[PDB]
Write an enzyme that holds these catalytic residues in place. Sequence first.
Site, PDB file in Angstrom:
ATOM      1  N   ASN A   1       0.975  -1.303  -0.337  1.00 42.28           N
ATOM      2  CA  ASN A   1      -0.259  -0.257   0.304  1.00 42.28           C
ATOM      3  C   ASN A   1       0.819   1.410  -0.046  1.00 42.28           C
ATOM      4  OD1 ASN A   1      -2.497  -1.708   0.143  1.00 42.28           O
ATOM      5  ND2 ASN A   1      -2.944  -1.323   2.028  1.00 42.28           N
TER       6      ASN A   1
ATOM      7  N   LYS B   1      10.737 -16.485 -34.487  1.00 39.16           N
ATOM      8  CA  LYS B   1      10.559 -15.101 -34.548  1.00 39.16           C
ATOM      9  C   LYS B   1       9.864 -15.255 -36.220  1.00 39.16           C
ATOM     10  CE  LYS B   1      11.707 -13.097 -31.191  1.00 39.16           C
ATOM     11  NZ  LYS B   1      11.179 -12.438 -30.318  1.00 39.16           N
TER      12      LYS B   1
ATOM     13  N   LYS C   1      13.781 -21.583 -27.688  1.00 37.23           N
ATOM     14  CA  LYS C   1      12.579 -21.294 -26.830  1.00 37.23           C
ATOM     15  C   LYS C   1      11.146 -20.200 -27.481  1.00 37.23           C
ATOM     16  CE  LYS C   1      12.584 -17.259 -24.429  1.00 37.23           C
ATOM     17  NZ  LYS C   1      11.235 -16.703 -24.697  1.00 37.23           N
TER      18      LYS C   1
ATOM     19  N   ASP D   1       8.166 -17.885 -27.360  1.00 36.25           N
ATOM     20  CA  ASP D   1       8.783 -15.983 -27.530  1.00 36.25           C
ATOM     21  C   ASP D   1       7.483 -15.906 -26.005  1.00 36.25           C
ATOM     22  OD1 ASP D   1       9.045 -13.658 -28.210  1.00 36.25           O
ATOM     23  OD2 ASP D   1       9.171 -13.537 -29.735  1.00 36.25           O
ATOM     24  N   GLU D   2       7.967 -15.408 -24.990  1.00 30.60           N
ATOM     25  CA  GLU D   2       6.756 -15.054 -24.223  1.00 30.60           C
ATOM     26  C   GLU D   2       5.696 -14.846 -24.167  1.00 30.60           C
ATOM     27  OE1 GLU D   2       9.099 -11.683 -25.101  1.00 30.60           O
ATOM     28  OE2 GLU D   2       7.005 -11.662 -26.059  1.00 30.60           O
TER      29      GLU D   2
ATOM     30  N   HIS E   1      10.824 -15.729 -17.589  1.00 27.77           N
ATOM     31  CA  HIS E   1      10.886 -14.903 -18.564  1.00 27.77           C
ATOM     32  C   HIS E   1      10.463 -14.054 -17.813  1.00 27.77           C
ATOM     33  CE1 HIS E   1      10.718 -11.854 -21.813  1.00 27.77           C
ATOM     34  NE2 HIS E   1      11.107 -12.261 -22.370  1.00 27.77           N
ATOM     35  N   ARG E   2      10.689 -12.353 -17.544  1.00 22.71           N
ATOM     36  CA  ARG E   2      10.940 -11.682 -16.773  1.00 22.71           C
ATOM     37  C   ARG E   2       9.679 -10.109 -17.154  1.00 22.71           C
ATOM     38  NH1 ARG E   2      15.988  -7.590 -16.659  1.00 22.71           N
ATOM     39  NH2 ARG E   2      16.276  -7.105 -18.772  1.00 22.71           N
TER      40      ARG E   2
ATOM     41  N   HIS F   1      16.119 -13.619 -17.103  1.00 21.61           N
ATOM     42  CA  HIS F   1      16.881 -13.513 -17.589  1.00 21.61           C
ATOM     43  C   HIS F   1      17.249 -11.532 -17.179  1.00 21.61           C
ATOM     44  CE1 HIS F   1      15.060 -13.848 -22.222  1.00 21.61           C
ATOM     45  NE2 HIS F   1      14.841 -14.454 -21.298  1.00 21.61           N
TER      46      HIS F   1
ATOM     47  N   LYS G   1      19.196  -4.113 -26.983  1.00 20.41           N
ATOM     48  CA  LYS G   1      18.241  -3.702 -28.104  1.00 20.41           C
ATOM     49  C   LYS G   1      17.008  -2.864 -25.858  1.00 20.41           C
ATOM     50  CE  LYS G   1      14.206  -7.203 -28.490  1.00 20.41           C
ATOM     51  NZ  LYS G   1      13.779  -7.510 -29.357  1.00 20.41           N
TER      52      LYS G   1
ATOM     53  N   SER H   1      19.632 -11.534 -23.364  1.00 20.29           N
ATOM     54  CA  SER H   1      18.423 -11.711 -24.531  1.00 20.29           C
ATOM     55  C   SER H   1      18.040 -10.271 -25.258  1.00 20.29           C
ATOM     56  CB  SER H   1      17.173 -12.874 -24.233  1.00 20.29           C
ATOM     57  OG  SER H   1      17.369 -12.218 -25.244  1.00 20.29           O
TER      58      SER H   1
END
Lengths: 140, 467, 465, 230, 356
Positions: free
Chosen positions: B115, B167, B193, B195-196, B286-287, B319, B326, B371
């Site tokens: 809170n 991808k 992997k 993708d998230e 994965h974050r 990760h 990037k 990554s």
Amino acid sequence: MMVWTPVNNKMFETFSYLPPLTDEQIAAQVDYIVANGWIPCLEFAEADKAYVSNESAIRFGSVSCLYYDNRYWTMWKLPMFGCRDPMQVLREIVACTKAFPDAYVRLVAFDNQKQVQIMGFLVQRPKTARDFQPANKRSV
Amino acid sequence: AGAGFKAGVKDYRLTYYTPDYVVRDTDILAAFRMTPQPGVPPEECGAAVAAESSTGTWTTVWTDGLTSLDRYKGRCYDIEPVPGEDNQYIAYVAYPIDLFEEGSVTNMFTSIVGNVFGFKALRALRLEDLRIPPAYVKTFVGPPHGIQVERDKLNKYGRGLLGCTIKPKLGLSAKNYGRAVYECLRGGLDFTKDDENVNSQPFMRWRDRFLFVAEAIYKAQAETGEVKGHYLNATAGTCEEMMKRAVCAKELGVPIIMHDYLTGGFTANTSLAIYCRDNGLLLHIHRAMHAVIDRQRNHGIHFRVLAKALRMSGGDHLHSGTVVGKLEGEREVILGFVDLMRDDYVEKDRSRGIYFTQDWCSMPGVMPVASGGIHVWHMPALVEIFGDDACLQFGGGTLGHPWGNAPGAAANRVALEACTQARNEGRDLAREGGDVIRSACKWSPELAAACEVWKEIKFEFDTIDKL
Amino acid sequence: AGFKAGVKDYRLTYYTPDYVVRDTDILAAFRMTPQPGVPPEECGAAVAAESSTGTWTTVWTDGLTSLDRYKGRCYDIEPVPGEDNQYIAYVAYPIDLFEEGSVTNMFTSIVGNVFGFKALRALRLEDLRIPPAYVKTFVGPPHGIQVERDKLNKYGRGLLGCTIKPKLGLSAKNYGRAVYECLRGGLDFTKDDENVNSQPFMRWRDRFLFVAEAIYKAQAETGEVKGHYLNATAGTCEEMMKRAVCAKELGVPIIMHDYLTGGFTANTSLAIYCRDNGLLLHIHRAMHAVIDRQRNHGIHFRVLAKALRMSGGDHLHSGTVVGKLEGEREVILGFVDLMRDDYVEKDRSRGIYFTQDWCSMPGVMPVASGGIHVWHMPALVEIFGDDACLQFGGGTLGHPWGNAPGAAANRVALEACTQARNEGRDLAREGGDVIRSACKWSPELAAACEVWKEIKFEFDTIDKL
Amino acid sequence: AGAGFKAGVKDYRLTYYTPDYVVRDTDILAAFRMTPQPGVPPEECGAAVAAESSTGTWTTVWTDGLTSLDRYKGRCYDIEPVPGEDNQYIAYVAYPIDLFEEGSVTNMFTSIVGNVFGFKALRALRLEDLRIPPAYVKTFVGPPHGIQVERDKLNKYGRGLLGCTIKPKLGLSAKNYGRAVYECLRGGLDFTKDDENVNSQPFMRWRDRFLFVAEAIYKAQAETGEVKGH
Amino acid sequence: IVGNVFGFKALRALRLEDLRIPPAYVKTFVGPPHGIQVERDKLNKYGRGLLGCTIKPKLGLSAKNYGRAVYECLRGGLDFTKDDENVNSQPFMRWRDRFLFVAEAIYKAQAETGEVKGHYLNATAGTCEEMMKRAVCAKELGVPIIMHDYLTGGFTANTSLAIYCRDNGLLLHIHRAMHAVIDRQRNHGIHFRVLAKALRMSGGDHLHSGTVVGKLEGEREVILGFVDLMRDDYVEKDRSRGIYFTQDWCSMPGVMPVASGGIHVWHMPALVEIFGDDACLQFGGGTLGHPWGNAPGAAANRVALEACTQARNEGRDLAREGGDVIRSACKWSPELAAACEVWKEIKFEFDTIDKL
Ligand SMILES: O=C(O)[C@@](O)(COP(=O)(O)O)[C@H](O)[C@H](O)COP(=O)(O)O
Ligand SMILES: O=C(O)[C@@](O)(COP(=O)(O)O)[C@H](O)[C@H](O)COP(=O)(O)O
Ligand SMILES: O=C(O)[C@@](O)(COP(=O)(O)O)[C@H](O)[C@H](O)COP(=O)(O)O
Ligand SMILES: [Mg+2]
Ligand SMILES: [Mg+2]
Ligand SMILES: [Mg+2]
Ligand SMILES: [Mg+2]
């Protein structure tokens, strides 16, 4: 565009994508082991026991996740605890490969603080192996 | 008469600011970067944060007298001014171990960040670090396996692991997914992997993907003679769906699944981590969403705390950032929490954003994953930053190779092995890195093609999350 | 069009200013702050790309599928008035991108990676347009406002609640003692504090049992249906479910869950359980202000509220306007409509960026909580109307005469304000009069009025429109 | 060359007697009352106890080198002579928290009292005390309720509780058991109990007893207006 | 029988020496999951003692190193290896990781040698639920044998595990951790022969029996007594061996005695003479302490055992010719010779506390 061959192109983990290691390059890796205080050891396997396989899983229920046969190889003597002389390691490579001329032989090193193998690469494959390509015949 | 019940509002600092308190070794400690409103003393603001994240509310309650507030109250025990800031302070708060549910990251967060971030009396608040004491660390199952056990199960030693996200992110059919997976793995990548955001969708349902991916993993493993994996995404709408997906991975005998721990949540993540422990599955974390929370210097939770929380909740990989890719993450900041992720004992070091000495009391380490926007030219920097105990993932950097996935994978694998060899021979990757890569591009036609395409590509911008 | 390896601008594929949005598209409004030298079009296109189908370099695999069909599209960019380097970028996502019934998946795409991009200095998700075709894939709230009122047999006024205090440190028996005394005085509900789960000082099952005794005692005594939000929030889904099962087996009306610290996957599971077993589900928004407080970066609470309505919850905390925690009147009024109503038209003065059609998904009861007391009652009733729960933790357990008088004071104040409103009185103008007349009539209320008369929470608002 | 593998037997004290060791706040500590055989120094005896309840065996093993014995070994860190005794010593042993399975008393006993009590080299051994550190205490679920919660559930305060074992220990029928239970509880006892050896037997099967006892508890409770148990 | 009476003020000491368990009570017990005959039949192992080995150091090895040491031990000629009694699941090595790597090791050594191999995977745990999970994993891995610490785990858990093993065809090795707390002193406690009878009833395929000649106490005549009580169907009263009552086991399967603790190659003749073929002889330090490593250490122990066995079969008296038998073997076998050299002078000879 070159095509990566799927035929007789088996690999051997660390350094297997580089040109084969010269004796000078092997000695440099051994220096690295000694400079870092790691424990050198040699392991070997006959050809039929060299690559990961699944045969034991015939005995399993649904518990094969991360089980493979042929991950363990056979220990050459004992790990060289307290060894600080690179020449001693090189002499054991010679002795191991002489006793087992037709075996795969890999050099590994252990870290006892992390308690894990910290390095490893193949130092001999049998002359009868035909399941690998020389670096220039990996793509066509 | 002694001390009794007096109704009404009083300053929080009268109870919750205790500058002479000597912290206990079982206390959970928090470092809050605090920006008070005009006219609110830092002592009162720190006391407010301490009170409203532990035992206290806005007015005096009679029920305090039935218990021992001394025993349970959170305590602001120190306040540091921030150099370079007129109105920023580091408030240190100590929480008794009794306040927390054993094994529950959810409960820890609910108290500490529940809170207090919305209080009108403060303009901004950031949680910078937590000191998790051994006595609380020991209440957690923690990571299903950890770095040593993962390497041992995979039989992979002596170099960074290499991965790759398939991808386009979304839009591929299950069959085309497995097709791409196989071609990536067979060329020298250890992992690919989902993708998230690849869960189960109209263009590709999850069970179709798992089956085709299983075919791909086993084909590439037979072809190369190396253990392969693909992080199959168990992230789902409900715990029941999540578990069904984990169970399928188990029944296929594949090595590794993944979970988006922040978008799925800590309750689901801890459940999955326990499942993976009991069934021998590696768990990649994965974050996704972390930067919503962790990007800004003035407000949120720093990623190092989100990383500590994951290590407690459970994950074999997490990760970490790339430095050079990037997505944002400064070298010194990343090096700080990488140590917090991997090591057993990490001493206070403010130059790396470590506010507290952290003893993990033999909880397994979590493998950092670099990554996002990285390619072959980045390889020497990555190896130099992370060392061998890391996974380096190349999505676009593999599927964007001019000759396709297998050559793309071989380019990345040659580059990693060349750098690893160079480092082992005593070469300095920080200076000689470009030379190592150039020598490698000259030797390997696959690597040369990659080097040529991405030669001019850099990601250099002003850093937001500065120390 | 063949494969050409290498990096090109995102805007070449992902900036589509002439795109006409489909009625099935998920729409996002991002408040975007680009780095120097990055055009707004390229920054908007990067956000669209990296939250949908694209990465940093061209991939050959695009050619196997139809990028036109699947790509997210930045279709509009508005400059922000008063800001030199802020823009509203509007992104459209095809419905095919999302897993049916999964708030987790929606968030993973839309807010997964883009907030960490080096090329932007700040990013905030302001709103989402959830189309009917996607809304319909969700189970949604276990019950909703109408069914909740019907099961409780409570009509014609706001509901009254109270968080037991101190937050932590009370034993299970003392917890139920406090609960009984609160409920018997006039409160409809009490609740576990968000961080009350299971601890050395009080284990959950002990609390559940003593609280059940308290609910049933207070119900028998008053003749009104009572409840206490028992916290199912836990470390694992298995523990969470154990606590929900015990609630079911005790026959009590209502449990709670901290949806953000527990997480959406666990929350959706719990909501489905509650639907299937007839338990009301109170949702606490612990952690939201970590995400939603700053104007320049994060996710605005209106989006977190839409996500909760989809994931499932009968109550959700909304803010108070006048209490100890931040929330501007016009901002709160906006998302209260988004939580309760079936159809909410675009209205930028209340921060509503998109017309939202809920297609008959049940409404969620807003809960006003945190630093409120009797003097706030007219304002609360005026802001929220009847369809809200008003919670007084410190404002009940802080009463000089104890819990039951404290509860009575809050209940009298609420009913006085409600009656006044029904009689045609303007609470915005006459509120003070209504309360003063009530403090004169009720000794319990008078004691409360005296203690908190001078207490106000007035500070500069961070989260401005 | 550094520290390598040397096969053969050496004294335990060379590794496991560490009188200068500063104990950690996470260590499990043990106080052993130790009676060595004639000709066995107390230091060697304490070291043997420390070794054979932690990491060590009777001869040097090569596998030590793969791990860190410094990290894992039990350590005899102090030895006190016992006043009044010619051949008794208190040996203090510290065990790293890593040695123990979380939440398992079974495992704690298996290490600390597993084999060492039978060693030929000692005549007698008694474990007197253990220091269980908070970091290990926290791994246990512990008591289902505890004193405060028990009193709160029973609504019983301000005096000791009163109980009573039903007699004869064995040989009563289920019906007679409940008859005796009711008469005890109704007279003012809070509890009655099965004798330790009353489980399920030919004279009285367990479920028969449980039902008649339930009848008795509820009858006494209604009669007295006080919560009863058995 | 032992619930309260040992604490009575009116006595200074009390020791339960023996129990006569009548056939009518014996018959109420499931008993051992398999027993000596069935165990030999399932393993296809006959005509010699079985050979085992506890992995060392006791604690501190990783799961991968545990399997590594197990593979090297088994491949050299040992039938079994085992988790140390206190190896359960710990920060340094979690149980399921160990079970998997040990399975790989068993199957590799079995394929390499052509002989059936096993490793006693420890099911001992904090709760019955955890204990069962570990038993279930062993079942699903298809491995032959698990172990349980019956006294520290307890009889209730032990009997449950034994029933599971019977229903799932797992062999059950029993470790007697904690027994000497109870059974060492002559004046007070419970003699091990009673704890052994209790185990035969509760259920176990193996039970540790002592060595006579190793690092832990147990007198020859005492041990011979309860070894008969563990293995045989009918054992007559014999006070010279501490047997106070004639014991009729009414066809309850026999339990294999396990000699373990501070034994090495020079003890082999004595061990074979004391126990005969129906025993498992375990060499932890005696294998992993060999100068050449585990495989040669195993081979040294296997050679020694077979040499003694052959000698006995040829009519040689191991009690007086045992030295000759081993010396001829150390001369013949280099592996053996290395073991013989290291442990030649090593004896464990102390005054005995638990005398008849
Ligand atoms: O979705 C993506 O963009 C990625 O698949 C990388 O794609 P590329 O390999 O093609 O760049 C990763 O999930 C991000 O790196 C996550 O960022 P972080 O590691 O910072 O959490
Ligand atoms: O912990 C607290 O402070 C409360 O129990 C209120 O106590 P008081 O009634 O004593 O103030 C509520 O959980 C907060 O209002 C949550 O904030 P929000 O509703 O904004 O999510
Ligand atoms: O922990 C040990 O000491 C052992 O592993 C033996 O190790 P070594 O082979 O290295 O001596 C055994 O558990 C003991 O023999 C048990 O004693 P007992 O059989 O009398 O119960
Ligand atoms: Mg991704
Ligand atoms: Mg609260
Ligand atoms: Mg009794
Ligand atoms: Mg042992």
